[PDB]
DNA sequence: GATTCACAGCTGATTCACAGCATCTA
DNA sequence: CTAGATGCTGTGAATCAGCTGTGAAT
């Protein structure tokens, strides 16, 4: 059975399939629309658990549509896709992500709005607060940058899975990022000197394959 | 069980929705209307505990709508949404009792607070650590001694106290504390947090924290 | 004066590229 | 054995996030 029913609405088909492929892979049941009519129809046809909405769409905007769905009885929270004005995106049970986004941030925020509508991350001695973005190593606090935290959360969620540098970059970095994978090497080096300082090495290198967060064998 | 039954009357659909969503999320049972006839119909069927009326409306203004409700024997207290430039004298004389007003554009935090007061007055001190606030008088105490706050500094502080221990991003604060039509920079929140820290965060133990790239949180250091 | 808030200087954090060194393996 | 491939990390530049002082306007 799926994690949730998600309606993805954006006038850009490339943003729509990028989200639908990632979320379909993460266990979600995904329906799409590239306009307000299609959106209203699909939402009435499938009654989703949450809606991902491009804020800037030709003709009918999401706000008009949300008002109609909620007046029917569909109280599904919205995760707005906004450009980098439009305000009110954090009212009720809704939240938003700015374009260009990363796959990790869209799923993370989507999961928050769903949990909020209807619990710290740990691996060995690493503790993550998804709310505050606070980190601890052996009960001691460690300060991490936004990128360092997203990367650690990716590894923790995917503990014991070998993750290649191109895969990490496609999930952790924004989809408009134009550089190579040495940025991943740099951020693994920072993570190591901040949260892999204990007797046992937890973040491992497998040459030409990837990185893996696992307890030493 | 709902906090109260509220009837929201305004001619603009998205003002009604802005109000509806916020009050529903706060634990209120919200009924709506876009005119005086629907308003009287909803009031007869739902029997609201408070009514929120837009003053400037076509056909029949908010004052007209209230007069019709009261003529029907619906004595629920009212909260008027007034225009800044007009009916100044009429609003002063019509709010001497149980009814109150907020000027449009309003802050969602101020509407809700003013609704809780008219509901309370019709049949009271917020606290966090050594900070005390009177929701009715707008007085603030920091470790038993008074502190003078502006209207914006007061709405900001109450938002933090009510939501103590919860991380609040600058856009979330702007959406709730600032006037809904605010088209400015998040720096305004940075400014008012600096105003608050200078007055209420003055001891060895920090209460109002910054989590870089996340937001602000009011909590004891632990 | 009180107030709101725009704006800009400042600071330290953050992102990221780049290169030279280390280690691995063909 | 060596030599290229692959990975690590110090240096530095550019940008950014958040804090605060000044001042315009009401
Ligand atoms: Ca668009
Ligand atoms: Ca990519
Ligand atoms: Ca009106």
Short mmCIF file of C-alpha atoms (C1' of nucleotides) and ligand atoms in Angstrom, two decimals:
data_model
loop_
_atom_site.label_atom_id
_atom_site.label_comp_id
_atom_site.label_asym_id
_atom_site.label_seq_id
_atom_site.Cartn_x
_atom_site.Cartn_y
_atom_site.Cartn_z
CA UNK A 1 0.00 0.00 0.00
CA UNK A 2 1.31 3.60 -0.69
CA UNK A 3 2.78 6.17 1.86
CA UNK A 4 0.19 8.79 0.70
CA UNK A 5 -1.84 10.06 -2.32
CA UNK A 6 -0.16 13.19 -3.76
CA UNK A 7 -1.52 15.52 -6.45
CA UNK A 8 1.43 17.27 -8.30
CA UNK A 9 0.28 20.45 -10.17
CA UNK A 10 2.69 22.59 -12.26
CA UNK A 11 2.31 24.17 -15.74
CA UNK A 12 5.85 22.78 -16.50
CA UNK A 13 5.71 19.06 -17.43
CA UNK A 14 9.45 18.65 -16.75
CA UNK A 15 8.99 19.76 -13.04
CA UNK A 16 5.88 17.51 -12.82
CA UNK A 17 7.59 14.27 -13.99
CA UNK A 18 10.83 15.05 -11.94
CA UNK A 19 8.61 15.18 -8.79
CA UNK A 20 6.35 12.27 -9.83
CA UNK A 21 9.29 9.89 -10.59
CA UNK A 22 11.07 10.69 -7.20
CA UNK A 23 7.87 10.45 -5.14
CA UNK A 24 6.60 7.27 -7.00
CA UNK A 25 10.01 5.77 -6.05
CA UNK A 26 9.65 6.90 -2.38
CA UNK A 27 6.40 4.92 -2.02
CA UNK A 28 3.87 7.67 -2.87
CA UNK A 29 0.81 7.25 -5.17
CA UNK A 30 1.13 10.26 -7.56
CA UNK A 31 -1.42 12.01 -9.83
CA UNK A 32 -0.54 15.03 -11.98
CA UNK A 33 -2.06 18.17 -13.66
CA UNK A 34 -0.60 20.98 -15.78
CA UNK A 35 -3.53 23.47 -15.23
CA UNK A 36 -6.29 24.50 -12.73
CA UNK A 37 -9.14 22.59 -14.50
CA UNK A 38 -7.10 19.30 -14.73
CA UNK A 39 -6.08 19.91 -11.07
CA UNK A 40 -9.71 20.38 -9.93
CA UNK A 41 -10.81 17.27 -11.95
CA UNK A 42 -7.98 14.99 -10.70
CA UNK A 43 -8.47 16.26 -7.08
CA UNK A 44 -12.22 15.44 -7.30
CA UNK A 45 -11.47 12.06 -9.05
CA UNK A 46 -8.76 10.91 -6.53
CA UNK A 47 -9.26 13.02 -3.26
CA UNK A 48 -5.51 13.35 -2.34
CA UNK A 49 -3.76 13.31 1.07
CA UNK A 50 -1.72 16.45 0.02
CA UNK A 51 -1.28 18.76 -2.98
CA UNK A 52 2.01 20.08 -4.46
CA UNK A 53 1.15 23.32 -6.21
CA UNK A 54 2.94 25.64 -8.60
CA UNK A 55 1.85 29.08 -7.40
CA UNK A 56 2.43 30.84 -10.77
CA UNK A 57 0.16 29.07 -13.32
CA UNK A 58 -1.55 30.60 -16.43
CA UNK A 59 -5.26 31.39 -15.96
CA UNK A 60 -6.66 29.73 -12.80
CA UNK A 61 -4.24 29.79 -9.81
CA UNK A 62 -4.04 27.17 -7.05
CA UNK A 63 -5.64 29.47 -4.43
CA UNK A 64 -8.97 29.55 -6.31
CA UNK A 65 -8.84 25.76 -6.69
CA UNK A 66 -7.92 25.12 -2.96
CA UNK A 67 -10.88 27.20 -1.80
CA UNK A 68 -13.25 25.05 -3.99
CA UNK A 69 -11.72 21.67 -2.80
CA UNK A 70 -11.99 22.69 0.91
CA UNK A 71 -15.64 23.88 0.39
CA UNK A 72 -16.41 20.32 -0.93
CA UNK A 73 -14.78 18.58 2.07
CA UNK A 74 -11.17 17.88 0.86
CA UNK A 75 -9.01 19.28 3.72
CA UNK A 76 -5.66 18.22 2.11
CA UNK A 77 -2.63 20.45 2.94
CA UNK A 78 -0.74 22.25 0.10
CA UNK A 79 2.99 22.46 -0.43
CA UNK A 80 3.46 25.49 -2.62
CA UNK A 81 6.09 25.62 -5.35
CA UNK A 82 7.18 29.20 -5.46
CA UNK A 83 9.76 31.19 -7.41
CA UNK A 84 12.93 32.77 -5.90
CA UNK A 85 4.88 39.35 -3.73
CA UNK A 86 3.23 35.90 -3.11
CA UNK A 87 2.39 35.67 0.64
CA UNK A 88 0.16 33.46 2.86
CA UNK A 89 1.92 30.28 1.91
CA UNK A 90 2.34 29.15 5.59
CA UNK A 91 -1.28 29.64 6.71
CA UNK A 92 -3.26 26.64 8.06
CA UNK A 93 -1.53 23.32 7.48
CA UNK A 94 0.22 24.53 4.33
CA UNK A 95 3.95 25.18 3.70
CA UNK A 96 6.14 25.99 0.69
CA UNK A 97 9.43 25.28 -1.15
CA UNK A 98 11.23 27.74 -3.42
CA UNK A 99 12.25 26.79 -7.04
CA UNK A 100 14.93 25.62 -7.71
CA UNK A 101 14.58 22.96 -4.97
CA UNK A 102 16.28 19.66 -4.13
CA UNK A 103 14.44 16.26 -4.09
CA UNK A 104 15.41 15.86 -0.35
CA UNK A 105 13.83 19.20 0.67
CA UNK A 106 10.52 18.64 -1.31
CA UNK A 107 9.98 15.14 0.24
CA UNK A 108 11.03 16.34 3.74
CA UNK A 109 8.50 19.31 3.69
CA UNK A 110 5.86 17.10 2.01
CA UNK A 111 6.30 14.57 4.87
CA UNK A 112 5.94 17.37 7.50
CA UNK A 113 2.66 18.79 6.05
CA UNK A 114 1.23 15.18 5.84
CA UNK A 115 2.24 14.26 9.46
CA UNK A 116 0.76 17.64 10.59
CA UNK A 117 -2.57 16.67 8.90
CA UNK A 118 -2.65 12.88 9.63
CA UNK A 119 10.51 11.55 16.74
CA UNK A 120 14.25 12.57 16.16
CA UNK A 121 16.33 10.85 13.40
CA UNK A 122 19.03 8.58 14.78
CA UNK A 123 21.83 6.26 13.62
CA UNK A 124 24.19 4.75 16.24
CA UNK A 125 25.14 7.88 18.32
CA UNK A 126 24.13 10.54 15.74
CA UNK A 127 20.93 12.44 16.53
CA UNK A 128 19.08 14.81 14.20
CA UNK A 129 16.25 17.17 15.04
CA UNK A 130 14.29 17.60 11.80
CA UNK A 131 12.52 20.74 13.31
CA UNK A 132 15.46 22.74 14.74
CA UNK A 133 18.16 21.12 12.51
CA UNK A 134 20.13 20.45 15.74
CA UNK A 135 22.69 17.63 15.68
CA UNK A 136 24.34 15.64 18.48
CA UNK A 137 27.26 13.17 18.48
CA UNK A 138 27.55 11.04 21.67
CA UNK A 139 25.11 13.40 23.45
CA UNK A 140 27.29 16.46 22.56
CA UNK A 141 25.88 19.16 20.22
CA UNK A 142 27.52 19.83 16.83
CA UNK A 143 26.66 22.78 14.60
CA UNK A 144 26.05 21.90 10.89
CA UNK A 145 25.43 24.12 7.84
CA UNK A 146 22.11 23.62 5.82
CA UNK A 147 23.89 21.57 3.13
CA UNK A 148 25.82 19.53 5.77
CA UNK A 149 22.50 18.76 7.56
CA UNK A 150 20.60 17.77 4.37
CA UNK A 151 23.50 15.45 3.38
CA UNK A 152 23.60 13.80 6.86
CA UNK A 153 19.80 13.35 6.84
CA UNK A 154 20.06 11.68 3.38
CA UNK A 155 22.74 9.25 4.74
CA UNK A 156 20.81 8.56 8.01
CA UNK A 157 17.51 7.82 6.15
CA UNK A 158 19.52 5.68 3.68
CA UNK A 159 21.80 4.04 6.35
CA UNK A 160 23.47 0.85 5.06
CA UNK A 161 22.80 1.76 1.39
CA UNK A 162 25.91 2.64 -0.75
CA UNK A 163 25.15 5.99 -2.40
CA UNK A 164 27.12 7.17 -5.42
CA UNK A 165 28.34 10.77 -5.74
CA UNK A 166 26.04 11.38 -8.86
CA UNK A 167 23.00 9.97 -6.90
CA UNK A 168 23.78 12.15 -3.79
CA UNK A 169 24.12 15.26 -6.02
CA UNK A 170 20.77 14.47 -7.78
CA UNK A 171 19.04 14.17 -4.36
CA UNK A 172 20.74 16.61 -2.03
CA UNK A 173 21.70 19.49 -4.39
CA UNK A 174 19.24 21.81 -6.12
CA UNK A 175 18.17 20.74 -9.63
CA UNK A 176 19.78 23.92 -11.12
CA UNK A 177 23.24 23.05 -9.59
CA UNK A 178 25.82 23.09 -12.42
CA UNK A 179 29.01 21.74 -10.89
CA UNK A 180 30.62 18.27 -10.51
CA UNK A 181 30.66 15.72 -7.67
CA UNK A 182 33.84 17.02 -5.92
CA UNK A 183 31.30 19.19 -3.97
CA UNK A 184 30.04 15.87 -2.47
CA UNK A 185 33.67 14.93 -1.54
CA UNK A 186 34.01 18.32 0.27
CA UNK A 187 30.74 17.87 2.18
CA UNK A 188 31.65 14.26 3.15
CA UNK A 189 34.98 15.70 4.46
CA UNK A 190 33.09 18.28 6.55
CA UNK A 191 30.63 15.66 7.89
CA UNK A 192 33.52 13.43 8.85
CA UNK A 193 35.33 16.09 10.89
CA UNK A 194 32.00 17.11 12.60
CA UNK A 195 30.11 13.75 13.25
CA UNK A 196 32.60 10.91 12.51
CA UNK A 197 35.08 11.77 15.30
CA UNK A 198 34.44 8.67 17.48
CA UNK A 199 36.39 5.40 18.07
CA UNK A 200 34.43 3.73 15.21
CA UNK A 201 34.31 5.09 11.59
CA UNK A 202 30.63 5.25 10.45
CA UNK A 203 30.88 7.12 7.09
CA UNK A 204 32.72 4.87 4.62
CA UNK A 205 34.31 5.18 1.18
CA UNK A 206 33.93 2.39 -1.39
CA UNK A 207 36.24 3.37 -4.31
CA UNK A 208 34.43 3.94 -7.62
CA UNK A 209 31.08 2.91 -5.99
CA UNK A 210 29.95 5.39 -3.35
CA UNK A 211 29.64 6.36 0.30
CA UNK A 212 27.83 4.50 3.06
CA UNK A 213 26.71 5.27 6.60
CA UNK A 214 27.11 1.90 8.44
CA UNK A 215 28.42 0.49 11.73
CA UNK A 216 31.94 -1.02 11.17
CA UNK A 217 31.89 -4.80 10.58
CA UNK B 1 -15.13 20.13 20.65
CA UNK B 2 -14.82 23.67 19.10
CA UNK B 3 -13.55 26.74 21.04
CA UNK B 4 -16.72 28.64 19.68
CA UNK B 5 -19.04 28.94 16.61
CA UNK B 6 -17.97 31.95 14.47
CA UNK B 7 -19.87 33.59 11.61
CA UNK B 8 -17.59 35.40 9.07
CA UNK B 9 -19.28 37.93 6.71
CA UNK B 10 -17.31 39.77 3.96
CA UNK B 11 -18.02 40.36 0.19
CA UNK B 12 -14.46 39.23 -0.85
CA UNK B 13 -14.12 35.40 -1.06
CA UNK B 14 -10.41 35.31 -0.27
CA UNK B 15 -10.84 37.47 2.92
CA UNK B 16 -13.52 34.98 4.09
CA UNK B 17 -11.09 32.09 3.24
CA UNK B 18 -8.13 33.80 4.94
CA UNK B 19 -10.31 34.17 8.08
CA UNK B 20 -11.99 30.75 7.83
CA UNK B 21 -8.74 28.73 7.48
CA UNK B 22 -7.02 30.57 10.33
CA UNK B 23 -9.95 30.25 12.75
CA UNK B 24 -10.54 26.57 11.80
CA UNK B 25 -6.84 25.83 12.44
CA UNK B 26 -7.18 27.63 15.87
CA UNK B 27 -10.09 25.31 16.92
CA UNK B 28 -13.16 27.38 15.85
CA UNK B 29 -16.29 26.11 14.04
CA UNK B 30 -16.48 28.58 11.10
CA UNK B 31 -19.62 29.45 9.07
CA UNK B 32 -19.44 32.00 6.26
CA UNK B 33 -21.51 34.48 4.20
CA UNK B 34 -20.86 37.04 1.44
CA UNK B 35 -23.99 39.22 2.05
CA UNK B 36 -26.65 40.11 4.66
CA UNK B 37 -29.31 37.59 3.48
CA UNK B 38 -26.90 34.54 3.68
CA UNK B 39 -25.58 36.08 6.97
CA UNK B 40 -29.13 36.08 8.52
CA UNK B 41 -29.74 32.54 7.17
CA UNK B 42 -26.48 31.13 8.64
CA UNK B 43 -27.07 32.94 11.99
CA UNK B 44 -30.61 31.39 12.22
CA UNK B 45 -29.30 27.84 11.50
CA UNK B 46 -25.92 27.89 13.33
CA UNK B 47 -26.46 30.40 16.20
CA UNK B 48 -22.87 31.82 16.28
CA UNK B 49 -21.04 32.75 19.50
CA UNK B 50 -19.35 35.74 17.73
CA UNK B 51 -19.73 37.41 14.35
CA UNK B 52 -16.91 38.97 12.22
CA UNK B 53 -18.32 41.56 9.86
CA UNK B 54 -16.66 43.47 7.04
CA UNK B 55 -17.89 47.08 7.33
CA UNK B 56 -17.50 48.20 3.68
CA UNK B 57 -19.80 45.87 1.68
CA UNK B 58 -22.17 46.54 -1.28
CA UNK B 59 -25.96 46.38 -0.86
CA UNK B 60 -25.79 46.38 2.93
CA UNK B 61 -22.77 47.36 5.00
CA UNK B 62 -21.62 45.44 8.15
CA UNK B 63 -23.49 47.82 10.46
CA UNK B 64 -26.65 47.07 8.46
CA UNK B 65 -25.97 43.31 8.71
CA UNK B 66 -25.50 43.52 12.53
CA UNK B 67 -28.70 45.64 13.00
CA UNK B 68 -30.69 42.94 11.12
CA UNK B 69 -29.11 40.11 13.25
CA UNK B 70 -29.92 41.97 16.50
CA UNK B 71 -33.46 42.77 15.26
CA UNK B 72 -33.87 38.92 14.91
CA UNK B 73 -32.64 38.48 18.53
CA UNK B 74 -29.12 37.20 17.72
CA UNK B 75 -27.09 38.96 20.47
CA UNK B 76 -23.63 37.39 19.64
CA UNK B 77 -20.74 39.97 20.10
CA UNK B 78 -19.29 41.41 16.87
CA UNK B 79 -15.84 42.14 15.45
CA UNK B 80 -15.87 44.75 12.69
CA UNK B 81 -13.31 44.98 9.89
CA UNK B 82 -13.06 48.72 9.25
CA UNK B 83 -11.49 50.87 6.48
CA UNK B 84 -8.77 53.20 7.83
CA UNK B 85 -10.04 56.43 6.13
CA UNK B 86 -13.79 56.32 7.10
CA UNK B 87 -16.81 55.93 9.53
CA UNK B 88 -14.36 56.81 12.43
CA UNK B 89 -17.06 58.35 14.66
CA UNK B 90 -19.69 55.60 13.97
CA UNK B 91 -17.15 52.83 14.80
CA UNK B 92 -16.09 54.59 18.06
CA UNK B 93 -19.76 54.85 19.19
CA UNK B 94 -20.71 51.28 18.13
CA UNK B 95 -17.78 49.58 19.97
CA UNK B 96 -18.24 51.16 23.49
CA UNK B 97 -19.71 47.82 24.67
CA UNK B 98 -19.12 44.18 23.73
CA UNK B 99 -18.35 44.80 20.01
CA UNK B 100 -14.86 45.60 18.78
CA UNK B 101 -13.04 46.48 15.53
CA UNK B 102 -9.72 45.86 13.66
CA UNK B 103 -8.72 48.03 10.71
CA UNK B 104 -8.39 46.24 7.32
CA UNK B 105 -5.63 45.17 6.28
CA UNK B 106 -5.24 43.21 9.50
CA UNK B 107 -2.83 40.75 11.12
CA UNK B 108 -4.26 37.23 11.58
CA UNK B 109 -2.83 37.21 15.13
CA UNK B 110 -4.73 40.47 15.98
CA UNK B 111 -8.13 39.25 14.60
CA UNK B 112 -7.99 36.01 16.65
CA UNK B 113 -6.83 37.72 19.82
CA UNK B 114 -9.64 40.35 19.46
CA UNK B 115 -12.18 37.53 18.81
CA UNK B 116 -10.96 35.72 21.99
CA UNK B 117 -11.48 38.92 24.01
CA UNK B 118 -15.05 39.64 22.74
CA UNK B 119 -15.89 35.93 23.36
CA UNK B 120 -14.34 36.21 26.89
CA UNK B 121 -16.05 39.64 27.66
CA UNK B 122 -19.45 38.05 26.56
CA UNK B 123 -19.29 34.92 28.84
CA UNK B 124 -6.34 35.87 31.03
CA UNK B 125 -2.50 36.38 31.48
CA UNK B 126 -0.03 34.69 28.99
CA UNK B 127 3.26 33.59 30.47
CA UNK B 128 6.66 32.11 29.52
CA UNK B 129 9.73 31.92 31.86
CA UNK B 130 10.02 35.37 33.63
CA UNK B 131 7.90 37.11 30.88
CA UNK B 132 4.23 37.96 31.68
CA UNK B 133 1.66 39.55 29.23
CA UNK B 134 -1.95 40.74 29.79
CA UNK B 135 -3.88 39.99 26.57
CA UNK B 136 -6.59 42.55 27.51
CA UNK B 137 -4.51 45.58 28.74
CA UNK B 138 -1.38 44.92 26.54
CA UNK B 139 0.91 45.27 29.58
CA UNK B 140 4.12 43.23 29.70
CA UNK B 141 6.33 42.38 32.67
CA UNK B 142 9.90 41.13 32.53
CA UNK B 143 10.80 39.60 35.89
CA UNK B 144 7.95 41.41 37.71
CA UNK B 145 8.92 44.90 36.39
CA UNK B 146 7.02 46.54 33.45
CA UNK B 147 8.32 46.86 29.88
CA UNK B 148 6.72 49.14 27.33
CA UNK B 149 6.08 47.48 23.90
CA UNK B 150 4.74 48.91 20.65
CA UNK B 151 1.66 47.32 18.97
CA UNK B 152 3.89 45.29 16.57
CA UNK B 153 6.41 44.30 19.32
CA UNK B 154 3.43 43.13 21.43
CA UNK B 155 1.80 40.98 18.66
CA UNK B 156 5.30 39.51 17.90
CA UNK B 157 5.95 38.65 21.60
CA UNK B 158 2.50 37.00 22.08
CA UNK B 159 3.07 34.91 18.93
CA UNK B 160 6.38 33.64 20.38
CA UNK B 161 4.89 33.01 23.90
CA UNK B 162 1.80 31.13 22.56
CA UNK B 163 4.13 29.08 20.26
CA UNK B 164 7.02 28.61 22.82
CA UNK B 165 9.40 25.80 21.98
CA UNK B 166 8.21 25.83 18.31
CA UNK B 167 10.64 26.97 15.54
CA UNK B 168 9.19 29.84 13.50
CA UNK B 169 10.69 30.87 10.15
CA UNK B 170 10.64 34.62 9.20
CA UNK B 171 7.98 34.04 6.41
CA UNK B 172 5.71 32.10 8.84
CA UNK B 173 5.97 35.05 11.39
CA UNK B 174 5.27 37.60 8.56
CA UNK B 175 2.19 35.60 7.52
CA UNK B 176 0.76 35.54 11.01
CA UNK B 177 1.96 38.75 12.82
CA UNK B 178 2.18 41.24 9.95
CA UNK B 179 -0.78 42.81 8.04
CA UNK B 180 -1.86 40.24 5.39
CA UNK B 181 -1.12 42.71 2.55
CA UNK B 182 2.52 43.25 3.67
CA UNK B 183 4.78 43.26 0.57
CA UNK B 184 8.11 43.70 2.33
CA UNK B 185 11.38 41.97 3.29
CA UNK B 186 11.83 39.46 6.18
CA UNK B 187 14.35 42.05 7.66
CA UNK B 188 11.32 43.70 9.37
CA UNK B 189 11.12 40.55 11.61
CA UNK B 190 14.92 40.76 12.17
CA UNK B 191 14.41 44.39 13.30
CA UNK B 192 11.52 43.61 15.70
CA UNK B 193 13.34 40.53 17.16
CA UNK B 194 16.30 42.89 17.86
CA UNK B 195 13.75 45.28 19.52
CA UNK B 196 12.41 42.38 21.68
CA UNK B 197 15.89 41.05 22.64
CA UNK B 198 16.99 44.58 23.84
CA UNK B 199 13.94 44.55 26.25
CA UNK B 200 12.92 40.99 27.24
CA UNK B 201 16.19 38.89 26.51
CA UNK B 202 18.61 40.72 28.86
CA UNK B 203 19.95 38.02 31.28
CA UNK B 204 22.62 35.26 31.37
CA UNK B 205 20.15 32.69 29.97
CA UNK B 206 19.00 33.40 26.37
CA UNK B 207 15.30 32.79 25.64
CA UNK B 208 14.88 33.97 22.01
CA UNK B 209 17.23 31.96 19.76
CA UNK B 210 18.24 32.08 16.10
CA UNK B 211 18.72 28.81 14.24
CA UNK B 212 20.54 29.99 11.08
CA UNK B 213 18.59 29.07 7.94
CA UNK B 214 15.64 27.76 10.02
CA UNK B 215 14.08 30.54 12.14
CA UNK B 216 13.57 31.78 15.67
CA UNK B 217 12.49 29.85 18.79
CA UNK B 218 11.44 31.12 22.22
CA UNK B 219 12.57 28.52 24.82
CA UNK B 220 14.81 28.12 27.93
CA UNK B 221 18.51 27.14 27.07
CA UNK B 222 18.75 23.34 27.68
"C1'" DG C 1 8.26 61.55 20.79
"C1'" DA C 2 6.49 56.87 19.17
"C1'" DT C 3 6.24 54.07 15.49
"C1'" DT C 4 6.97 51.29 11.17
"C1'" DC C 5 10.17 49.67 8.07
"C1'" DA C 6 13.47 50.51 4.22
"C1'" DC C 7 18.15 50.31 3.58
"C1'" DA C 8 23.01 49.56 4.03
"C1'" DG C 9 27.40 48.44 6.53
"C1'" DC C 10 29.34 44.81 9.02
"C1'" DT C 11 30.52 40.18 10.55
"C1'" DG C 12 31.08 35.55 10.34
"C1'" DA C 13 29.16 31.53 8.04
"C1'" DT C 14 28.58 29.16 3.95
"C1'" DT C 15 29.14 27.37 -0.71
"C1'" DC C 16 32.06 25.92 -4.02
"C1'" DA C 17 36.07 25.75 -7.20
"C1'" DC C 18 40.60 24.47 -7.56
"C1'" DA C 19 44.92 22.25 -6.94
"C1'" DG C 20 48.28 19.41 -4.88
"C1'" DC C 21 48.93 15.43 -2.17
"C1'" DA C 22 47.46 10.53 -0.71
"C1'" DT C 23 45.96 6.17 -1.72
"C1'" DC C 24 44.24 2.76 -4.67
"C1'" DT C 25 44.41 -0.39 -8.46
"C1'" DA C 26 45.28 -1.79 -13.26
"C1'" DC D 1 57.64 -2.51 -9.67
"C1'" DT D 2 55.04 2.07 -11.91
"C1'" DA D 3 51.44 5.33 -13.59
"C1'" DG D 4 47.00 6.84 -14.09
"C1'" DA D 5 42.62 7.04 -11.69
"C1'" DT D 6 40.23 8.34 -7.78
"C1'" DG D 7 39.61 10.55 -3.37
"C1'" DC D 8 40.80 14.00 0.42
"C1'" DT D 9 41.44 18.46 2.23
"C1'" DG D 10 43.70 23.15 2.68
"C1'" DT D 11 43.25 27.76 0.40
"C1'" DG D 12 40.65 31.47 -1.07
"C1'" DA D 13 36.96 34.01 -3.41
"C1'" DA D 14 32.37 35.12 -3.74
"C1'" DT D 15 28.09 35.36 -1.78
"C1'" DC D 16 24.75 35.02 1.96
"C1'" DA D 17 22.23 35.29 6.43
"C1'" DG D 18 21.38 37.74 10.27
"C1'" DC D 19 22.17 41.83 13.37
"C1'" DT D 20 22.16 46.65 14.11
"C1'" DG D 21 22.39 51.91 13.26
"C1'" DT D 22 20.30 55.68 10.69
"C1'" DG D 23 16.65 58.06 8.88
"C1'" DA D 24 12.23 58.90 6.14
"C1'" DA D 25 7.50 59.22 6.69
"C1'" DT D 26 3.28 59.25 9.51
CA1 LIG E 1 4.45 28.22 -13.41
CA1 LIG E 2 21.60 16.15 -11.67
CA1 LIG E 3 -15.49 44.71 1.46
#
